[PDB]
Structure formats: C-alpha cells, structure tokens
Amino acid sequence: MPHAFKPGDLVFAKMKGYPHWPARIDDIADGAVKPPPNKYPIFFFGTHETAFLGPKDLFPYDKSKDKYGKPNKRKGFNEGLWEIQNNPHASYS
Which residues form the signal peptide? Predict the structure, then answer.
C-alpha cells in the first residue's frame, strides 16, 4: 500500500495551464523557505523551477509514465523527461 509522499519521490506534477510535468519531491535545505502546511516543495525537471503543491496535483511516476511521459512542445519538457529517467536525484543547482 502507498505511504505519504516523501523527499526523493518521483512524480508528474500538474499545474493549471501546463501538461503533467516530470518532477520530484525536494528536500528543504537547512535555512531554506519551508512550504505552507499540507504542501510539498516540487522541483520540476527541465525548467528547474520549484512550486509548492498538495497531493491532488502529484501523480506517482511509475504508475503515470505510460500516460504522461511522452515528448511535449513546451520549453524544458523533453529535457525534463531525460532527467527524471536518467538522473532524477542529481543536483541541478
């Protein structure tokens, strides 16, 4: 059975007006801004941007990749697919 989301989990994350996007749950570094209650720091592959999202917008990668893991026109998306598949836990600082 599923656990709660934890840092390092790989997902497709959904934001209004964007396709389901390859992403990971990030750690919060010492001294970094914490997310609001019930929200997780989401690191979007390809764009390398962070947003705060709740579980309703988070689709586990393994279950969802056959639906969502296909090339997309959008800037950064295809780069994002390479990263989640090939080096999802790297530093993209």
Answer: none
The CATH code belonging to domain 10-28+38-85 is 2.30.30.140
The approach used to solve this structure was X-ray
Report resolution (Å) to 1 decimal: 1.8
* Token digits of residue 72: 């997309």
Residue 70 vs residues 46, 52, 66, 80, 88: alpha-carbon distances, Å: 14, 24, 8, 11, 17
Q: What is the CA radius of gyration of the chain?
A: 13
Look at phi and psi of residue 31 and say left if phi exceeds 0, alpha if psi is from -120 to 50, else beta: left
- Single-letter amino acid, residue 4: A
Torsion-angle region of 48 (φ positive above 0: left; ψ -120 to 50: alpha; else: beta): left
